[PDB]
Design a protein around this ligand. Structure first.
Ligand SMILES: COc1ccc(S(=O)(=O)N(CC2CCCCC2)C[C@@H](O)[C@H](Cc2ccccc2)NC(=O)c2cccc(O)c2)cc1
Lengths: 99, 99
């Protein structure tokens, strides 16, 4: 679809048979989800945002269906204010900015 | 134009006699610029993201040129690591997400 920006670009994603709302975030390098349980080995990681650095858990090769489009990639889990879909997966679903 | 997301969506913006590189950021409600001594009235504000909150100065009705598109609106000025063009100005240059 085409998504305008007068409202937050929130979409439904499917991860582990759970539906969640996530924000399409072109300013985010990474995909970062609020506290949740995911299967597999994780590696501790640190990432930086506007307010400083946080600790997150890195899960690789995780499938997510973003608004009907399939991705399989790195998902970070941690204390993000909102679930965000970043560039690593935006590229997988063929998302571009247009004006 | 169409901007892919393989790399950070950085573009040239103009605010007075300052050209700067800024992120076209669909995850940002508002525009946040690195510290600069803009003229006129402002109000203090706190904004939050990954890592917590920072203190900014909100300036209203500031003209910005973004990739040669004209915009005018609210700009938040403070100790951000990166210049951020938020949805308030993205809608004004006609910016959409497409996939
Ligand atoms: C109200 O206006 C706002 C409020 C918040 C923000 S925000 O910047 O915090 N922010 C708002 C978001 C924050 C997360 C939850 C939803 C709200 C915009 C976001 O795109 C930032 C941009 C960014 C990039 C690099 C360094 C610092 C910031 N990305 C990131 O925080 C980010 C960058 C690179 C890697 C990464 O893992 C995350 C912007 C405008």
């Amino acid at each position: 679809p085409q998504i305008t920006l007068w409202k937050r670009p929130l979409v439904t994603i499917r991860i582990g048979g759970q539906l969640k709302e996530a924000l399409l975030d072109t300013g985010a390098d990474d995909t970062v989800l609020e506290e949740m349980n995911l299967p597999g080995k994780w590696k501790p990681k640190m990432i930086g945002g506007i307010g400083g650095f946080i600790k997150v858990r890195q899960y690789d090769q995780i499938p997510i269906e973003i608004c009907g489009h399939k991705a399989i990639g790195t998902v970070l889990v941690g204390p993000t204010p909102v679930n965000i879909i970043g560039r690593n997966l935006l590229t997988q679903i063929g998302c571009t900015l247009n004006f």
